[PDB]
């Protein structure tokens, strides 16, 4: 059977959707890859051993349904470039992560009669998927909000992490300081390497910390704990074992994109969410659900403060913080992957 | 008022004399230093605005002062070097901190009727000390048990070090795992690097390390804790601010030089001592004062191992610490430097 996939790398969507292309060639698939090429995914995606199609669709980048139509030549010339692709492949089935790319490429496939699948994986619907997913066969979203019906099956999570004992067992006779997990990504959060070292000395030998401070900032951030009087707190540049961080910590302090929200709840670890601030607010509708289920606190930028981070981590018991471990857990979907290939499979099957 | 001081080859000799000299120098006394071209207080001392004389002994393959006593032209050239450099400066005492080029030195001295001072830092008395104490004006151990009488001193301690709260306040209300500071150095202890991350394993979540591994042994270090399960311990590859550790710190896993002993007391910390293993045991003999005190635990390599550490770590109650603490600190004499200084004035007054 052959699968197309669109995701591009922009907005995250290509890592999920390897996933899932991976979890496919296993089952004896073949997978194509339909993407642009000045993109992320061009490079990545045959670096993981897929072909990739490419097509244009400069200048219609970020307009919506009713803008693409507003633009007879362009959107034709792309979805021409997207047909022309899916009848020399012939794939069995498309699956759209979200990103513009999927657009043209959805109308393609559903011009040919090409059963379309879609995955959301943000709290809030792309601008893309919102409207492809009144032509798609199956739509899916990983937390419940981005569409009113879609089900819900969650974001592929990292086997390591998935892998962790359960809450209760991993804090199990746990005493002494909260253990608070920093984490700001490859690139680094500068808010938080600005912001925990003043939170560490108001907060004293309550916490124990590891700061992930991003590439070339580890210097800064040590230098920071230090003046702040808390020296003994580890800063690392970068955290390879995110497994073995988590399974360390009693609670996460991070930015909340989709799939860091999904392997936070796989780890059953509660977090307080520090959202990337945009008018769309992405971010903080993708941890809405956690905090909903009291698993997490989300501090918006508006609300951002010394104080209020230290508040907030001040007022969590061990007691409180095994109550949102689990209920963490509880709000995780671990075979968000194999969900997602087995509704491809069925949609391909015309089942 | 001019001073000559005398110290060897190593930074246990010369760092208590450099204390000595500044103090002296900021109280309008002139100081000028006797060393050796190629040992590192040649390039030590003139870094301190120094002026550095020196004896050159040539063919000594490093036997030391009982090789050069052995030698009659070496010696008598030493001496007389000596002395041409002493009727020159004319230095009103001599300050003798041990090492063989204090020896030729403080003949000269004797010989040309200049007051001789001496310092001993170690537990046990260095060879060229003992001789040279059969000519002295006055003789100072830093610990008792060096000489059967001389005047106990303690060493030089760094005034960071010196202020730090005592044991009570510090260790008033404090809970949770055992603070585990390991210190090997700037070149750091090979075997500490080795035998701590293991022992972490065994130990688990009842205690929190800082290992200092010493230059370029950060990163190996570092991926040792993460193999033995314990990623979490903070590693550095120095130490800047000891003080700053040693307020943190619970107890101490380190080499036992005589000037890291009187550190440890008057930080006033329970300590597991690793001597470098020698034939004379100088560090052992330096050690064994606080550990007679009840207030640290040696452990020679012979007998030393993971579960040797482990086992003892494990042994400490928070409550027992307490007790170490305050007797390291009732072992600890925080007026060394002034103490010595006073000394050297008084006897160059030929009081």
């Given at each position: 059977?052959r699968?197309?996939?669109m995701?591009?790398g922009?907005?995250?969507?290509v890592?999920?959707?390897?996933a899932?292309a991976?979890?496919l060639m296993?089952?004896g698939?073949?997978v194509?890859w339909?993407?642009?090429a000045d993109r992320?995914?061009?490079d990545?995606?045959?670096?993981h051993?897929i072909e990739?199609?490419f097509?244009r669709?400069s200048?219609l980048?970020?307009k919506?349904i009713?803008?693409?139509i507003?633009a007879?030549?362009?959107?034709?010339?792309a979805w021409?470039?997207?047909?022309?692709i899916?009848?020399?492949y012939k794939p069995?089935?498309?699956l759209?992560?979200?990103?513009?790319?999927?657009?043209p490429?959805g109308?393609?496939?559903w011009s040919l009669?090409?059963?379309?699948?879609?995955?959301?994986?943000?709290?809030?619907?792309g601008?893309?998927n919102?409207?492809?997913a009144?032509?798609?066969t199956?739509?899916?979203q990983?937390?419940?909000?981005?569409f009113?019906?879609?089900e819900?099956?969650?974001?592929?999570?990292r086997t390591?992490?998935?892998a962790?004992?359960?809450?209760?067992?991993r804090?199990?006779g746990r005493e002494?300081?909260?253990?608070?997990?920093?984490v700001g990504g490859?690139q680094?959060?500068?808010?938080l390497?600005?912001?925990?070292?003043?939170?560490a000395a108001?907060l004293?030998?309550?916490?124990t910390?590891?700061?992930?401070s991003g590439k070339?900032?580890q210097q800064?951030?040590?230098?920071?704990?230090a003046e702040?009087?808390?020296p003994?707190?580890?800063?690392?540049?970068?955290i390879?074992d995110?497994?073995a961080?988590?399974?360390?910590?009693?609670?996460?302090?991070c930015?909340?994109?989709?799939?860091?929200?999904?392997?936070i709840?796989?780890a059953?670890?509660?977090?307080?969410?520090?959202?990337?601030q945009?008018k769309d607010?992405q971010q903080?509708?993708?941890?809405?659900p956690?905090?909903k289920?009291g698993?997490?606190?989300?501090?918006?930028?508006?609300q951002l403060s010394?104080?209020?981070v230290?508040?907030?981590?001040?007022?969590?018991s061990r007691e409180?913080?095994?109550?949102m471990?689990?209920?963490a857990?509880?709000?995780s979907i671990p075979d968000?992957?194999?969900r997602?290939?087995n509704?491809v499979?069925?949609v391909?099957?015309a089942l």
């Amino acid at each position: 059977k052959r699968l197309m996939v669109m995701a591009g790398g922009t907005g995250g969507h290509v890592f999920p959707g390897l996933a899932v292309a991976h979890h496919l060639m296993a089952q004896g698939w073949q997978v194509r890859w339909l993407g642009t090429a000045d993109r992320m995914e061009a490079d990545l995606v045959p670096k993981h051993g897929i072909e990739i199609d490419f097509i244009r669709i400069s200048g219609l980048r970020g307009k919506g349904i009713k803008a693409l139509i507003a633009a007879p030549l362009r959107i034709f010339n792309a979805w021409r470039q997207a047909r022309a692709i899916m009848k020399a492949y012939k794939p069995d089935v498309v699956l759209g992560m979200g990103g513009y790319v999927s657009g043209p490429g959805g109308l393609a496939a559903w011009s040919l009669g090409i059963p379309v699948v879609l995955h959301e994986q943000n709290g809030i619907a792309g601008l893309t998927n919102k409207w492809l997913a009144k032509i798609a066969t199956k739509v899916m979203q990983a937390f419940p909000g981005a569409f009113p019906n879609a089900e819900v099956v969650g974001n592929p999570v990292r086997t390591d992490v998935l892998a962790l004992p359960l809450p209760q067992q991993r804090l199990a006779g746990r005493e002494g300081p909260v253990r608070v997990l920093v984490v700001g990504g490859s690139q680094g959060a500068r808010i938080l390497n600005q912001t925990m070292p003043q939170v560490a000395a108001k907060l004293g030998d309550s916490v124990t910390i590891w700061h992930q401070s991003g590439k070339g900032s580890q210097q800064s951030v040590e230098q920071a704990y230090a003046e702040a009087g808390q020296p003994q707190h580890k800063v690392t540049e970068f955290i390879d074992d995110m497994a073995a961080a988590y399974a360390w910590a009693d609670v996460v302090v991070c930015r909340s994109g989709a799939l860091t929200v999904s392997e936070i709840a796989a780890a059953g670890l509660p977090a307080l969410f520090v959202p990337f601030q945009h008018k769309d607010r992405q971010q903080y509708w993708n941890a809405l659900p956690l905090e909903k289920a009291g698993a997490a606190k989300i501090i918006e930028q508006p609300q951002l403060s010394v104080d209020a981070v230290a508040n907030t981590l001040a007022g969590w018991s061990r007691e409180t913080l095994l109550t949102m471990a689990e209920r963490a857990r509880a709000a995780s979907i671990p075979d968000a992957t194999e969900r997602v290939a087995n509704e491809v499979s069925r949609v391909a099957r015309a089942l």
